[PDB]
A paper describes a structure:
For this study, we aimed to introduce a spectrally distinct heme within the MtrC heme chain noting that His/Met hemes in their Fe(II) states have a broader, red-shifted Soret band than their His/His-ligated counterparts. Thus, we introduced to MtrC a methionine in place of the distal His561 ligand of Heme 8, Fig. 1A, blue. We were unable to prepare diffracting crystals of Ru-MtrC Met8 or Y657C H561M MtrC. However, diffracting crystals of H561M MtrC could be obtained under similar conditions as for wild-type MtrC, and the structure, resolved to 1.60 Å, confirmed Met561 as the distal ligand of Heme 8 with a Fe-S(Met) distance of 2.3 Å, SI Appendix, Fig. S2. Superposition of the wild-type and mutant protein structures revealed no major global structural differences, with a total main chain rmsd of 0.3 Å as calculated using SUPERPOSE. The rmsd of both main chain and sidechain atoms within 6 Å of hemes 8, 9, and 10 (minus the distal ligand of heme 8) was also calculated, yielding values of 0.2 Å and 0.4 Å, respectively, indicating no significant localized changes surrounding these hemes. A high-potential center (Em +199 ± 16 mV versus standard hydrogen electrode [SHE], error is SEM) was revealed for Ru-MtrC Met8 for which there was no counterpart in Ru-MtrC His8. Introducing a spectrally unique His/Met ligated heme at a site distant from a Ru-photosensitizer has allowed unambiguous detection of intramolecular ET within the MtrC heme chain. Transient absorbance has quantified rate constants for ET between the intervening heme pairs. The values, summarized in Table 3, describe ET between Hemes 10 ↔ 9 and Hemes 9 ↔ 8 with closest edge–edge distances of 3.7 and 4.3 Å, respectively.
For these proteins, a defining feature is close-packed c-type hemes often in van der Waals contact and arranged as approximately linear chains that span the tertiary structure. Shewanella MtrC has evolved to support anaerobic respiration, specifically to deliver electrons from intracellular respiratory chain enzymes to extracellular terminal electron acceptors such as mineral oxides of Fe(III) and Mn(IV) and humic substances. In the native state, MtrC contains 10 optically indistinguishable His/His-ligated hemes.
Author numbering: 44 to 670
């Protein structure tokens, strides 16, 4: 017995006896009543002091009325709370909005049914009817974009409304610590201008992901009537969380301000909203001005691929590349072979900067039809490694010079791409060709897609933008399949051009795509993701292992490549052999048909000999599952 989702509703609030009696109804995912909850609580009872009541320009704030763990299980899915010590401070005012924060701890019913954590708030007037006014600015869903839903965010709770219900102005005032008010703390912990906590943690990682982008948490909503407070209610307490060098009292960094009375007079909502979103809005507009449509064909005689790039405008109308060449900062074409198991490795792949700072490479031309045309020079070894090796796949990344939200001429032929304020990564593309002229093979894209990446990195993520690459913006341009609802899947299959089974530039980096994303995020995003496979995966495509060969897993002493059988390679990214993270010894893994950091030939020969999935039945919900 296990409940998937515990739903909680406050269905009745009665003040007929003085302190409120609060009834909560608990249901599961099938809307069935949940009887026997042992850890249900009113974590906070609050009332809302309205905007400006504590002084001109000041925020609304949640005044404390107490808490209760005293309830009766009514044996029908409902639970009725009483307060032993309601409103200890004697501040209860029936003219104010009343809030209850209800939490149910993860654990078990008597029958031993597992129950997950649940949290909610609901607001009422002072007689238990619907409320007359609210402070509804954000909703828990925005935090779940980046923080694993149902797990504690830092401490105490899993949903932002619970945080807000404890980290009040009254709480911060009572501790003599303005910074622990939630409206200060939330921006402070994602912004690197000052450290937080006893340890002076500098939020470097949070700053690099959030980038002060208000729209990752402040989202327009009909369900949130105070959503525009982020631009409409400027206060020194909140604005100082990132603007840490102003002293309003002393007029240092700013004209003196002794209260919040005049902030809105100068800091109008339009200006605050525009200035903090201007750069991301401008970049997004630049990215959406142009597209590319890419084709590739194989010469049946020479077995070279010819890649043709059509620039298009926002409407999909042809643009002759000659008209914008002076503003093309880079265009790169990377070609590999065998989309399900790349065969050329990193050193064998075909690659070219066809354009650099307005200059065509001599190997690339613009034809009379205004398309860029480039022919591979590397041996593509088409057809030399089974049916999959009939297909060449070419990834096109490009960038355009830009300044303050406008495209500009690339004025410097040697511009090295380090200063990312001087150009924009544009929409990348993927083109398939076959030697045989049959339909191309394509990689599966049904287990991970760019929608997952975009939850943390935004849809405008210019991947690898800098000295080495133009910046790859991943969109429906390189979609070749739809999901069961007919939505275009934006896959990471193009990334395999470089993220090959042989790795990237070094054999030591687990460069294979099957290893690299999981390696990077277990090392650098563990605080957000940990073991949460669902942060990237809708599914595991375990059938894909039947199309894989050896995967590079290490470098030998002499810098040559060591390889594992593919399931072992994939699991050992996190579960390092010989470490505290892997019970199976090397000898045991070999007993299950694996090659562990051996030769490419031994790993290739054994690649379909692994018995792992006889015992292991991993799902995204539980990757650890065994018979
Ligand atoms: C992605 C765009 C994010 C959204 C939306 C939110 N958070 Fe976040 N948070 C994010 C990162 C990358 C980090 C740094 C993690 C690290 O390992 O350093 C954080 C950090 C926090 C913290 C600090 C605790 C810590 O883990 O360092 C807290 C308390 C926090 N975040 C809370 C939080 C809440 C309540 C959000 C919804 C309003 C929220 N975050 C959104 C990335 C993102
Ligand atoms: C009371 C019931 C709490 C709830 C719910 C949450 N937090 Fe909390 N938090 C609480 C206390 C008593 C303290 C210590 C404050 C102090 O005096 O120093 C904290 C501290 C934090 C901090 C550290 C803040 C800083 O040092 O600048 C963070 C980052 C924090 N809390 C985050 C947080 C989040 C995201 C919550 C919802 C998931 C949350 N807290 C709930 C008490 C309470
Ligand atoms: C999530 C990580 C956030 C980002 C990024 C930004 N804000 Fe935010 N803000 C967030 C929360 C959870 C809250 C508390 C809401 C509540 O119900 O208490 C806020 C609050 C503000 C406020 C206070 C509004 C008020 O009524 O006093 C302002 C003025 C505010 N936020 C502004 C703001 C701006 C300008 C940001 C981009 C630079 C921004 N926020 C980012 C969560 C997050
Ligand atoms: C961190 C999440 C921030 C919060 C909260 C606030 N601001 Fe901010 N502000 C932030 C950044 C990263 C920048 C630079 C923006 C850019 O792209 O140029 C700003 C800038 C300002 C400015 C203009 C710069 C100046 O020198 O005046 C103003 C006037 C400004 N911010 C005001 C402001 C107000 C009134 C806030 C509370 C509502 C506020 N900011 C919060 C980051 C963050
Ligand atoms: C008009 C007379 C003002 C009043 C009243 C307040 N502020 Fe202000 N502020 C004003 C200007 C002209 C600027 C510089 C704008 C620019 O783009 O250069 C500012 C700047 C800020 C900033 C940003 C500081 C920085 O980035 O260096 C913040 C965070 C800020 N102001 C907040 C603020 C608050 C909270 C106020 C009421 C207490 C307030 N300001 C009053 C003009 C005026
Ligand atoms: C939030 C839970 C994340 C999801 C989902 C994905 N990524 Fe991520 N990524 C995340 C963090 C916290 C970091 C480290 C940031 C730091 O400052 O250290 C990363 C790092 C990357 C990098 C490195 C480049 C960078 O811009 O920092 C890349 C290239 C990257 N991530 C790509 C990426 C892709 C393609 C994803 C979908 C498979 C993906 N990430 C998911 C947080 C999160
Ligand atoms: C060749 C032109 C490449 C293409 C196309 C892509 N990547 Fe890459 N990536 C490349 C190298 C040479 C390296 C460094 C060596 C290494 O293997 O680590 C990388 C690195 C990454 C990383 C690690 C963090 C980082 O350095 O940014 C990640 C998470 C990564 N690459 C992801 C990735 C994705 C999602 C791609 C398709 C959108 C992609 N890369 C393409 C070389 C090349
Ligand atoms: C985003 C940062 C990821 C997280 C978190 C996890 N995985 Fe992953 N995984 C990711 C990518 C980009 C790929 C490559 C897809 C490709 O086309 O090669 C993978 C691949 C796997 C595979 C191979 C089978 C497949 O579905 O493609 C397995 C078995 C796999 N990943 C397992 C796995 C587990 C168990 C995770 C949680 C502990 C996990 N992944 C997280 C990106 C990310
Ligand atoms: C990093 C993205 C991971 C990859 C890739 C895989 N696993 Fe994993 N696994 C991971 C974590 C963070 C944890 C929790 C560790 C803990 O605290 O216990 C796990 C756990 C397991 C377990 C249960 C633990 C045990 O001692 O057996 C199993 C059985 C397990 N993982 C299996 C497994 C398999 C078969 C994988 C390849 C398909 C695999 N994991 C990849 C993180 C990651
Ligand atoms: C049945 C006879 C098994 C075969 C065949 C393989 N594994 Fe296994 N594995 C098995 C058990 C009972 C456990 C422990 C489960 C638990 O919850 O404790 C495991 C564990 C792993 C783990 C997790 C390791 C850790 O966290 O310490 C991984 C990554 C793992 N196994 C991988 C794996 C691979 C790659 C195999 C084929 C070569 C393989 N296992 C075979 C049972 C069995
Ligand atoms: Ca209700
Ligand atoms: Ca909830
Ligand atoms: Ca900070
Ligand atoms: Ca295309």
């Amino acid at each position: 017995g296990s409940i998937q989702t515990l739903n909680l509703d406050i269905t009745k609030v009665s003040y007929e006896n003085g302190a409120p009696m609060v009834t909560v109804f608990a249901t599961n995912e099938a809307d069935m009543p949940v009887i026997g909850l042992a850890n249900l609580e009113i974590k906070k009872a609050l009332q809302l002091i309205p905007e400006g009541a504590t002084g001109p320009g000041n925020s609304a704030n949640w005044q404390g009325l107490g808490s209760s763990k005293s309830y009766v299980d009514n044996k029908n899915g409902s639970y009725t709370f009483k307060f032993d010590a309601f409103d200890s401070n004697k501040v209860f005012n029936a003219q104010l909005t009343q809030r209850f924060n209800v939490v149910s701890a993860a654990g078990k019913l008597a029958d031993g049914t597992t129950v997950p954590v649940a949290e909610m708030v609901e607001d009422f007037d002072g007689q238990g009817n619907a409320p007359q006014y609210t402070k509804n600015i954000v909703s828990h869903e925005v935090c779940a974009s980046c923080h694993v839903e149902g797990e504690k965010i830092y401490h105490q709770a899993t949903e932002v409304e619970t945080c807000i219900s404890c980290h009040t102005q009254e709480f911060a005032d009572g501790r003599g610590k303005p910074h622990v008010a939630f409206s200060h703390l939330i921006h402070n912990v994602h912004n690197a201008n000052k450290a937080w906590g006893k340890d002076n943690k500098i939020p470097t990682v949070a700053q690099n992901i959030v980038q002060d982008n208000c729209q990752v948490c402040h989202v327009e909503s009909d369900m949130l009537t105070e959503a525009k407070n982020w631009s409409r209610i400027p206060t020194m307490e909140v604005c100082s969380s990132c603007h840490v060098d102003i002293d309003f009292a002393a007029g240092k960094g700013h004209s003196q301000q002794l209260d919040n009375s005049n902030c809105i007079a100068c800091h109008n909502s339009d200006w605050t909203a525009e200035l903090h979103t201007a750069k991301t809005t401008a970049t997004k507009n630049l990215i959406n001005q142009y597209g590319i449509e890419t084709t590739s064909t194989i010469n049946t005689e020479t077995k070279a691929a010819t890649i043709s790039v059509q620039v298009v405008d926002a409407n999909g109308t042809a643009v002759d590349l000659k008209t914008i060449l002076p503003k093309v900062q880079r265009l790169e074409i990377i070609t590999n072979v065998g989309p399900n198991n790349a065969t050329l490795g990193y050193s064998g792949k075909d690659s070219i900067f066809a354009i650099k700072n307005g200059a065509l490479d001599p190997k690339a031309t613009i034809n009379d039809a205004g398309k860029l045309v480039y022919t591979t020079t590397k041996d593509l070894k088409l057809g030399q490694n089974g049916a999959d090796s009939d297909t060449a796949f070419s990834f096109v990344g490009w960038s355009m010079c830009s300044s303050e939200g406008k495209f500009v001429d690339c004025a410097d032929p040697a511009f090295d791409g380090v200063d990312v304020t001087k150009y924009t990564g544009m929409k990348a593309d993927l083109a398939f060709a076959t030697l045989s002229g049959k339909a191309p093979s394509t990689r599966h894209v049904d287990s991970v897609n760019m929608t997952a990446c975009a939850n943390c990195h935004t849809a405008e993520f210019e991947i690898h933008k800098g000295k080495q690459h133009a910046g790859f913006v991943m969109t429906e341009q390189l979609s070749h399949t739809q999901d069961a609802n007919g939505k275009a899947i934006v896959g990471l299959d193009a990334c395999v051009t470089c993220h090959t089974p042989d790795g990237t530039y070094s054999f030591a980096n687990r460069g294979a795509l099957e290893l690299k994303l999981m390696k990077k995020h277990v090392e650098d995003a563990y605080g957000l993701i940990g073991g949460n496979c669902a942060s990237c995966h809708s599914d595991f495509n375990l059938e894909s292992f039947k199309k894989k060969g050896a995967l590079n897993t290490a470098a030998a002493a002499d810098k040559t490549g060591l390889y594992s059988t593919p399931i072992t390679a994939t699991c050992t990214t996190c579960h390092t052999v010989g470490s505290q993270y892997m019970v199976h010894t090397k000898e045991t893994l070999e007993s299950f048909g694996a090659v562990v950091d051996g030769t490419k030939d031994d790993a290739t020969s054994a690649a379909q000999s692994e018995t792992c999935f006889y015992c292991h039945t991993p799902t995204v919900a539980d990757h650890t599952k065994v018979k």
